[PDB]
């Protein structure tokens, strides 16, 4: 995990933490992760 990404996950979580599949699809494109990684992370918060 790059810390540059970790900071983008934390920040998007303090904006919206309910992952709509329409927004999960997005974060993955902007931050470069695959959808099961973005989800599991939110779970740890």
Residue 2 to residue 23: CA distance in whole angstroms: 21
- At what resolution in Å was this solved? 3.5
Q: Is residue 43 within 8 Å of residue 15, measured between CB atoms?
A: no
Residues 6+ apart with CB under 8 A from 28: 34, 35, 38
Show me where the domains of the chain are located: 1-45
Residue 28 to residue 41: CA distance in whole angstroms: 12
Residues 6+ apart with CB under 8 A from 27: 8, 9, 12, 33, 38
In the CATH hierarchy, which fold is given to the domain comprising 1-45?
Answer: Arc Repressor Mutant, subunit A (1.10.10)
Structure-determination technique = X-ray
Residue 29 to residue 6: CA distance in whole angstroms: 15
């Amino acid at each position: 995990f790059s810390e540059e990404q970790k900071k983008a996950l934390d920040l998007a979580f303090y904006f919206d933490r309910r992952l709509t599949p329409e927004w999960r699809r997005y974060l993955s494109q902007r931050l470069g992760l695959n959808e099961e990684q973005i989800e599991r992370w939110f779970r740890r918060k």
